[PDB]
Amino acid sequence: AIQKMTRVRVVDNSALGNSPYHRAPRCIHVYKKNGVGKVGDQILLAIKGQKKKALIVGHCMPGPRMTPRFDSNNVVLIEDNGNPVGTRIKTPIPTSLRKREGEYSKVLAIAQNFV
């Protein structure tokens, strides 16, 4: 569950995600009627003093059985259109993303590992 103000880890190849900054990326908005983001939900993110959309691809909060619970709240940066900003995702990405409603094919294509 990623809400507003959660510090999230950008698991992505993008320069924004991988560049140092005095402030850790924070969720600014959860694109969901209840501001609670799960895997597959989009969120605004304050990176490097910039507003950027991103996709949740894993979180510490337990989910339904058979699905992975990660040690960190992992997020992937995406453009407003939806193209992922980075070109590679290193850490494992849950396979449950595939059947969820919404566009995830680009993220799955960029993903290296699945869990």
């Binding site: 059985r65 058979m66 699905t67 619970r69 990660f70 040690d71 396979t95 449950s96 590992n113």
Partner: protein, 217 residues
């Protein structure tokens, strides 16, 4: 004789017929899927069919950090780190879509719950994905791994040092001061091991369950 935990019911007012029915279903599924004996701390590889794909199997290897639930809903959550990312999965034992459960390394740990591995060093959760299964002698008590893990800095998911957790597998002397340990002792509750009415005697229940299992065989 290892009676899998899920068969033993938690005490309550629920009717025994419900447990008989649930055990019937559990055993009748076990006839199809071989649920091996394993304990919290043993390394397991679980193969499960993915509905997201089209009849394709997924394998996850990790250390069983908790055995929870009773009856048909019983689960075990097992942990690992993949590319430096700690991942835990809670697997339902009797889910029709777990194709296989392999006990790669059958062993017991000092604690019945290894949830503190989240706060332990990542090395203690890392397990080779392709590790080969070790072999235990047919007649042999399950090994008890007396490993005491080293913890990462004090801010932890839970106050593991507190007595109510009763953790024996953590090297507290390394991370916590004697003052901190003494402070944690303020929650000791020594009477809690001596209140005889709190103890749950399951000898008769286990005997009846064993009779049921043997009859099913």
């Amino acid at each position: 004789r290892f009676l899998s935990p899920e068969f033993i019911p938690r005490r309550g007012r629920t009717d025994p017929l419900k447990f008989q029915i649930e055990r019937k279903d559990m055993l009748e599924r076990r006839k199809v899927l071989h649920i091996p004996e394993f304990y919290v701390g043993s390394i397991l590889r679980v193969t499960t069919a993915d509905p997201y794909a089209s009849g394709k199997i997924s394998q996850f290897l990790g250390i069983c950090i908790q055995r929870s639930g009773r009856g048909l809903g019983a689960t075990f959550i097992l942990r690992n780190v993949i590319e430096g990312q700690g991942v835990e999965i809670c697997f339902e034992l009797y889910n029709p879509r777990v194709q296989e459960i392999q006990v790669v390394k059958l062993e017991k740990r000092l604690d019945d719950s290894l949830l503190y591995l989240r706060d332990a060093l990542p090395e203690y959760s890392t397990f080779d994905v392709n590790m080969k299964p070790v072999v235990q002698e047919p007649n042999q008590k399950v090994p008890v791994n007396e490993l005491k893990v080293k913890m990462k800095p004090k801010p932890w998911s839970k106050r593991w040092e507190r007595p109510n957790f009763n953790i024996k597998g953590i090297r507290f002397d390394l991370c916590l001061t004697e003052q901190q340990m003494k402070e944690a002792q303020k929650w000791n509750q020594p009477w809690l091991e001596f209140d005889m009415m709190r103890e749950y005697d399951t000898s008769k229940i286990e005997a009846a369950i064993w009779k049921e299992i043997e009859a099913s065989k």
